[PDB]
Subunit: 217 residues, 2 copies
Amino acid sequence: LTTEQLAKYIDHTNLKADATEADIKQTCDEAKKFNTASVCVNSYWIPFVTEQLKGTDVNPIAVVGFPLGAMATESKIFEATTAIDQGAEEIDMVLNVGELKGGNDEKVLADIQGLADAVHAKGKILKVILENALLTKDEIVRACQLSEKAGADFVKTSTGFSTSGAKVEDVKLMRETVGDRLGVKASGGIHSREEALAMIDAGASRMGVSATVAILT
Amino acid sequence: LTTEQLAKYIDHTNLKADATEADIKQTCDEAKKFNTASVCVNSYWIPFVTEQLKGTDVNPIAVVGFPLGAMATESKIFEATTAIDQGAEEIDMVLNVGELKGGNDEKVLADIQGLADAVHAKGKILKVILENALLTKDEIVRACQLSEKAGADFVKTSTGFSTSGAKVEDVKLMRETVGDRLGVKASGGIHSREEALAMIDAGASRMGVSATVAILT
């Protein structure tokens, strides 16, 4: 796998609370240099990122209800629809983990469903971050099934802000559950080229990466 | 200071991504038992908390743009006004740390002003979380001063999700900066009654606390 095609797997990611405009611009320069799939930022930076990436094949994408996933559904939707209207081509939302763990599957479903409707109405795609770190393996499976039932296009391992991120065995579990019906995105803690290839082998069709420069050089 | 009096300083706080309905209910039970000032939650739980605290003197309050502060201003605003209409009595926003650190004071100010105007139109109050952990001492001062100029009612130390929380010297610096013109809320890592009392002596007029039960007993 050449560095060029490895790059097309990568949502190049900068989500730290203290990222400055210069920091975000550097993320955009790096994504354009390596031709990654995306630049993934918090919603505030979507207009800037969109301008930086205009005229290239790199997509702006936004996280929403992130990273806790405990934002009201109405507000996750407003954040998502605003982000897309301002340039986002994909939305990575965070699952309502608390409702999942408390066994309120219908509320988990309703939350994702509302985002899926809003994002799809605008012709874009939705990824659901499960935050595997906080879930039992049965919960990872259930979260995958609910994401699918709600119409999500991808499931995503991690926000990057919990205790651990992508794990090969979790990625494989997710890919087995959704089959080829949803994309699987490995994110959080991906530091080396070997780790990245491991994730792809384990089933990931996309990756969230912030240490991208180290990996592709 | 009686335990009754101390309780009225406390926004009893449960913000973990994996907090279940039962977890949140228990937080409400505890707040009602000790008659704290508030129960502070992520915006999803506001209708439930409002119901649980109905007919009592404990206020539901919501964090917004939390914990990263990097939501688009308009989306922070929507999350805040929506939360108020569902029963939130106060809003604890996170300021835009990235624009603060990048020295774009115009944008930090406008972001806080948007929330302050909207929250005040509904007759509620706004606290601004600085996230001191990520800031220079000068930035803490500037953040307090921008918060004051924007019309905010409180400056708050920390989200609870960064590298450190309330520190006595930071609280003192904030109180000195805002005088008696704004409240100062110490939050994050307050684990003992002694620590809580020290935060008050340092100038805090309100506190965010998760270990509220241990502290009051």
